[PDB]
């Protein structure tokens, strides 16, 4: 019954989201519930809501200070409990609005995107990972590490008269909030000149 959890901050308000699921997806989750206790503002515990193969809770109860016990329960029996802090399991939200503009004057491509964490109250420092490769055939992705929402790709670095695929992801970089890479953004494509 081993499991994982991740938190996401200020999702649809001042409310945070906690998501958990079993490592083994071939598990009959019949009557198994997830309960989080501790590090909550007004209550001792919260029970997560099941949706197909995942469990979640959207709430404002998290203190974001101190550890919580997350338990897999069958009735009142604890099958497995793990202690973890909501502030150390933060999955960043994926960037969006990825755009590439070819600048002939500069002999480069200007890449821009929107970083949702910048609009949040907490966690205002994330590291971005931009990946690109030709849209046709198999290639090892070229990765660019950034701390801002723009980068340039010099023309000389890309093959001419070719179509490229580009995507981006983010991870918390903060001395308090720690966690996981976001999912990749949807991919954008662009064409290189002669």
């Amino acid at each position: 019954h081993s499991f994982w959890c991740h938190s996401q901050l200020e999702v649809d308000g001042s409310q945070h989201l906690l998501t958990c699921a079993f490592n083994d997806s071939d598990i009959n989750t019949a009557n198994l519930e997830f309960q989080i206790c501790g590090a909550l503002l007004r209550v001792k515990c919260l029970t997560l809501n099941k949706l197909q193969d995942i469990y979640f809770i959207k709430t404002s109860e998290f203190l974001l200070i101190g550890s919580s016990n997350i338990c897999v329960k069958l009735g009142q029996k604890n099958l497995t409990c793990k202690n973890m802090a909501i502030n150390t399991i933060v999955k960043a939200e994926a960037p969006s609005d990825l755009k590439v503009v070819y600048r002939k004057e500069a002999n480069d491509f200007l890449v821009t995107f929107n970083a949702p964490h910048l609009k949040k109250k907490y966690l205002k420092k994330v590291k971005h990972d931009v990946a690109y490769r030709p849209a046709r055939g198999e290639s090892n992705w070229t990765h660019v590490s950034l701390f801002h929402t723009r980068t340039t790709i010099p023309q000389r670095k890309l093959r001419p008269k070719a179509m490229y695929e580009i995507k981006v992801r983010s991870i918390p970089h903060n001395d308090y909030f720690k966690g996981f890479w976001s999912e990749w953004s949807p991919s954008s494509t662009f064409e290189t000149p002669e």
Binding site: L41, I65, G66, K121, Y122, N174, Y176, F177
Partner: protein
């Protein structure tokens, strides 16, 4: 309570991560310059003493800030990182006066982050 046994660096991390932001949310819409600054503090233990007082000791006009999210986090940080703080906890229980008082808290928390800056509280040379 004596705030000299606190993990100040851990408390500082908690302030900068979330508490600072929650105080700003509470004060939203007020002019920075709108409240006169009246409450001061010196060292980190003294600042925590004054933060303690203003956040949890009930004043007149502002009966309770204790239920506020910034206060609940402050109580959480002090219970985790100040040993014997929860063993000394007393076990029984927006106004234009609360905004004044929260403005005072913001200054103390900020002063808690400047412990190395000198003040009028002087005379300390040695051998």
């Amino acid at each position: 309570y004596d705030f000299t046994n606190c993990d100040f660096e851990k408390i500082k991390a908690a302030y900068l991560s979330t508490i600072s932001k929650d105080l700003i949310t509470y004060m939203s819409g007020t002019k920075s310059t709108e409240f006169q600054n009246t409450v001061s503090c010196s060292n980190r233990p003294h600042c925590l003493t004054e933060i303690q007082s203003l956040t949890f000791n009930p004043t007149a006009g502002c009966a309770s800030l204790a239920k506020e999210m910034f206060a609940m986090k402050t109580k959480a940080a002090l219970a985790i990182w100040c040993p014997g703080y929860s063993e000394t906890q007393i076990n029984a229980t927006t106004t234009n006066k609360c905004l004044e008082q929260v403005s005072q808290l913001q200054g103390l928390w900020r002063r808690f982050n400047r412990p190395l800056l000198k003040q009028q509280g002087t005379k300390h040379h040695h051998h």
